[PDB]
Structure 1
Amino acid sequence: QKGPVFLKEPTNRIDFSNSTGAEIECKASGNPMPEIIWIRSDGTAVGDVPGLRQISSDGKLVFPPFRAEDYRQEVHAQVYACLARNQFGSIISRDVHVRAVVNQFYEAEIMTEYVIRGNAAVLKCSIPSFVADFVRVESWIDDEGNVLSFSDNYDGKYLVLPSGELHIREVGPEDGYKSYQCRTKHRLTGETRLSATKGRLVITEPVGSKAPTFATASKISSLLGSSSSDIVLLCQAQAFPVPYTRWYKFIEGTTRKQAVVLNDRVKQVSGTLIIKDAVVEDSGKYLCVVNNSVGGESVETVLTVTAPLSAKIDPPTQTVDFGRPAVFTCQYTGNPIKTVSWMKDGKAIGHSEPVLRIESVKKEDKGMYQCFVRNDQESAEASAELKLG
């Protein structure tokens, strides 16, 4: 009656501690009921590995908890996929990146910040890059035990920025007597840690006027953020007299720009711009302009706001006579889209355009067709069926 279609596909990322294990499942419907087969990205069948990988009676793929000694790259750091098939044909799921994570040595560090009186301070909880996908800032704590937490109230002396930095407005001599530690949390184990080093501010009292200067000399950077997150664009400059900061956004591919419009969603916290509930349209090149009496400096930031990938094929099914063409159009959403690719019954077609054309249909052209859209973080698939007239 109908070829297979996925109901439930496992997600793109399956991250887990060796102490927890994981399970992934795949569901597909069709008539007859499709068979469910676990494969690797290269199409090869996956079987059990005693103690480490198990295909269950109901077709789940299970990774039991395991000793670090028993870690195996080809099991625990591996792209899998689910294959569903019946007599009409086969479809393969989006990529499933299985990543088991063992404990690692890490120590967070807080560089000392020198900050001119009246200017904003930004303390950073430096987390080693090789644990940073899992270990993130949970909160900050001052030397008295006051806890500073993520908050939607941006109008206070203190703000833990969504990106984890501690922002301190309008620093005064009293702010240099306080010290701060950052509490980090491992999202796979739940383990929290408080940085051993006490983060310090030194508050300077310059006598000469100082034109604005940024923390670093580079005048351009790129930033990636995801849709529906609160994206932080820093602008770490200082000056005496205290500077004013204004943000602009360039019209794509031009030398002209518009002042950013601050409102309930797009906020400025001293020099820092926070784009709340981000959407793909917030993408673009931003300009932070900092001026005082003595001069001005400007820095650019290229923001890319990503969105979850998805795809569909127009039409879901078509019945085409012999000798006549079959055409499939991959309709996709999300951002970025790096590649589009096509499959027929679980095997690649050498086509990377969004419209797949089969010029003259034959008997062996029938079956299941798929387009896959991919970027660095994500993949999505759509399936369609070709019947014979």
Structure 2
Amino acid sequence: QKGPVFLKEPTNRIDFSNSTGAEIECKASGNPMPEIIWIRSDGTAVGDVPGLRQISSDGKLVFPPFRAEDYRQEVHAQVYACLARNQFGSIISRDVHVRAVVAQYYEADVNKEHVIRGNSAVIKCLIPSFVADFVEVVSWHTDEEENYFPGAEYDGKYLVLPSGELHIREVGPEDGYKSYQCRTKHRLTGETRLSATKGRLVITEPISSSAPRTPALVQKPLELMVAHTISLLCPAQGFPAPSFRWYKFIEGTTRKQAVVLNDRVKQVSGTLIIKDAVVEDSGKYLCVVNNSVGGESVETVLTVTAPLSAKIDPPTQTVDFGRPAVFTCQYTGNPIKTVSWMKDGKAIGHSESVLRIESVKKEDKGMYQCFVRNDRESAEASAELKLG
């Protein structure tokens, strides 16, 4: 009576500590009831590995909590999928990226920041790149017992930015007798800790003028989710302390327009803050920094991401032999890198949103799917062809 359709798929990312374990669920309908098979996204079937990966009834793949000694990459750092299948054909779920992380000591550091008196400073909490997916800055603390949290600026001077740095306006000689530590939190173990080192501003008295200089290492392209606040920094030091202006390129041109500052889009010194991000905020930004000696600029690319979703019209159709069958994949989200089609679990080499079979024949019957992907997510829709 019907081919398979998914009712529940697991999300794209399943991250968890060895102590927590995980379970992922897949449910499909169909008649006859489809069998559910777990596969690695490349298509090989996966089995039971004692104490590590267990197929449950209902429809669940279980990763029990496990001791560090028992970590296995092929189980615990793997991209899975669910295959649902009956006599009418097969469909595969979106990719399920499993990342079991053994609970392990890390430290964050705060180093010295060399600044010219009168410039803004940005104090950073350095989190090792290999743990940074799981660790976020909660708050900043000084030796004089001042505590700074994300939200609003303190004393017209200190602001914990959305990206985690502590921004300090108009640094003075005085500010070099303070030391700064960050509190971080690990989302898989839930633990919080203070930074292993404390940083201080080291203030240079301006005795010579200099044109603004920006660091050698700059923010690589950013991907941030819709509806969250974003901060784009522009670190620069010079004397006279410089002024900062932000521009956004017109897509596919070398032309730019001044960013328009309002209730939603604000600038704090050289920092651009955009609340309530929307996909149209994506693009290429330029910060231009000037003083009476000279100027400099740096580009930052921003993509504002939105969850991927897909749906095929029509979800089922019957077409008489020799006649055309059209399936249209309707999708949402940002960015969309690719669209691609499968039939009964096998890529069919069509990468456009509308799939046309010009003249239907027996072996065209079965289940079709459209997958929409980008670098971080995937979404699928399915559809059945019945012969008339």
Q: Structure 2 length normalisation: TM-score?
A: 0.94
Matched with 2:170 is 170
RMSD across aligned positions (CA): 1.9
Q: Distance in 2 between matches of 1:180 and 1:160?
A: 12
Which secondary structure state, in structure 2, belongs to the residue aligned with residue 94 of structure 1? coil
Matched with 1:299 is 298
Q: After TM superposition, give the deviation of residue 176 of structure 1 in Å.
A: 0.9
Q: Distance in 1 between matches of 2:357 and 2:365?
A: 11
- 1:313·1:371 contact (CA, 8 Å) conserved in 2? yes
User: After superposition, what is the alpha-carbon deviation per residue over 1:94-133, rounded to whole angstroms, capped at 9, x for unaligned?
Assistant: 0001110013343222221112222211011111111111
Are 1:127 and 2:127 matched, yes or no? yes
Percent of aligned pairs with the same amino acid: 87
1:262-273 matches, within 5 Å, as 262-273=261-272
Q: Decide which moves more: 94-103 or 249-258.
A: 249-258
Q: After TM superposition, give the deviation of residue 308 of structure 1 in Å.
A: 1.6
Q: Distance in 2 between matches of 1:2 and 1:265?
A: 50
Which secondary structure state, in structure 1, belongs to the residue aligned with residue 211 of structure 2? strand
Are 1:60 and 2:47 matched, yes or no? no
Q: Which runs of 5+ in 1 are unaligned?
A: none
1:13-52 matches, within 5 Å, as 13-52=13-52
Aligned in 2, Cα 1:255/1:45: closer, same or farther, shift over 3 Å?
Answer: closer
Which secondary structure state, in structure 2, belongs to the residue aligned with residue 199 of structure 1? coil
Q: After TM superposition, give the deviation of residue 161 of structure 1 in Å.
A: 1.0
Q: Distance in 2 between matches of 1:10 and 1:237?
A: 44
Are 1:364 and 2:363 matched, yes or no? yes
Matched with 1:331 is 330
Aligned in 2, Cα 1:217/1:75: closer, same or farther, shift over 3 Å?
Answer: closer
Matched with 2:247 is 248
User: After superposition, what is the alpha-carbon deviation per residue over 1:346-367, rounded to whole angstroms, capped at 9, x for unaligned?
Assistant: 2221222322222321222111
User: After superposition, what is the alpha-carbon deviation per residue over 1:284-306, rounded to whole angstroms, capped at 9, x for unaligned?
Assistant: 11111112222222222222222
Q: Distance in 2 between matches of 1:31 and 1:305?
A: 41
Q: Which runs of 5+ in 2 are unaligned?
A: none
Q: After TM superposition, give the deviation of residue 199 of structure 1 in Å.
A: 0.8
User: After superposition, what is the alpha-carbon deviation per residue over 1:177-200, rounded to whole angstroms, capped at 9, x for unaligned?
Assistant: 111011111110012221121111
Q: Distance in 2 between matches of 1:152 and 1:61?
A: 44
Which secondary structure state, in structure 2, belongs to the residue aligned with residue 176 of structure 1? helix
Aligned in 2, Cα 1:13/1:155: closer, same or farther, shift over 3 Å?
Answer: farther
Q: After TM superposition, give the deviation of residue 54 of structure 1 in Å.
A: 1.3
2:147 partner amino acid: V
- 2:19·2:103 contact (CA, 8 Å) conserved in 1? no
Matched with 1:257 is 256
User: After superposition, what is the alpha-carbon deviation per residue over 1:149-177, rounded to whole angstroms, capped at 9, x for unaligned?
Assistant: 12155884211111111111111222111
User: After superposition, what is the alpha-carbon deviation per residue over 1:316-346, rounded to whole angstroms, capped at 9, x for unaligned?
Assistant: 2221110112122222222222222211112
1:142 partner amino acid: T
**In the comparison of the two structures, how many residue pairs are matched?**
388
1:97-176 matches, within 5 Å, as 97-152=97-152, 156-176=156-176
- 1:104·1:131 contact (CA, 8 Å) conserved in 2? no
- 2:153·2:160 contact (CA, 8 Å) conserved in 1? no
Matched with 2:312 is 313
- 1:344·1:369 contact (CA, 8 Å) conserved in 2? yes
Are 1:349 and 2:348 matched, yes or no? yes
1:323 partner amino acid: G
User: After superposition, what is the alpha-carbon deviation per residue over 1:1-40, rounded to whole angstroms, capped at 9, x for unaligned?
Assistant: 4322222210000000001101111122334443322222
Q: After TM superposition, give the deviation of residue 217 of structure 1 in Å.
A: 7.4
Q: Distance in 2 between matches of 1:384 and 1:210?
A: 65
2:264 partner amino acid: R
Which secondary structure state, in structure 2, belongs to the residue aligned with residue 130 of structure 1? coil
Q: After TM superposition, give the deviation of residue 72 of structure 1 in Å.
A: 0.9
- 1:221·1:300 contact (CA, 8 Å) conserved in 2? no
Q: Distance in 2 between matches of 1:348 and 1:121?
A: 52
